[PDB]
Amino acid sequence: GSSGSSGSKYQLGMLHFSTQYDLLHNHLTVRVIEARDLPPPISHDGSRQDMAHSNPYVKICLLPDQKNSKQTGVKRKTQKPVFEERYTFEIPFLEAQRRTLLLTVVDFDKFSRHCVIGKVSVPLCEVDLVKGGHWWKALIPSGPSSG
């Protein structure tokens, strides 16, 4: 029970990620991939700020659980955050299917307020984890949730 989005497209950007579940280890293997088309460090507004480079980072989480969130190391001044790191999560397939892979892209810096650039949610119910996942999505403008 929440509002939707309809109108001016969202040119927030795009993030690369792959969702694969390991049967041998019986855990969720979520490897974080690089990204591109990410907006500069801005609070209110302002075109491509000059000489504006910070240390961005990507977070991880498995909905509906939005408490135990993970985060990749902090890279050096760069527009395209790339880590190519792998992660694990002891979760029973049965649950996995019900759970959802959500990735949040937030910048890290002194005056780096909680102005997340965008998020990317994807249900692991349809996708085949046992076989692994790998696609490209366009970050969406997160919003309020009463659930």
CA distance 135 to 141: 19
Which DSSP helix (H) or strand (E) runs through 120? strand 118-123
Q: Please tell me the experimental approach by which this structure was elucidated.
A: NMR
**3-state class (DSSP) for residue 97:** helix
The answer to whether the CB of 13 falls within 8 A of the CB of 139 is yes
The secondary structure of the chain in percent helix, strand, coil, rounded to multiples of 5, reads 5, 35, 65
User: Hey, what are 57's tokens?
Assistant: 């980072």
The answer to whether the CB of 68 falls within 8 A of the CB of 89 is no
What CA–CA distances, in Å, run from 16 to 1, 79, 100?
29, 14, 16
Please, which residues have CB within 8 angstroms of residue 48's CB and are 6 or more apart in sequence? 40
Domain count, the chain: 1
Q: After which residues is the chain broken (C to N over 2.5 A)?
A: none
User: Hey, what are 61's tokens?
Assistant: 């989480």
CATH number of the domain within which 88 lies? 2.60.40.150
Q: For residue 109, count other CB atoms closer than 10 A to its CB.
A: 13
**What is the extent of the structural domain holding 140?**
1-147
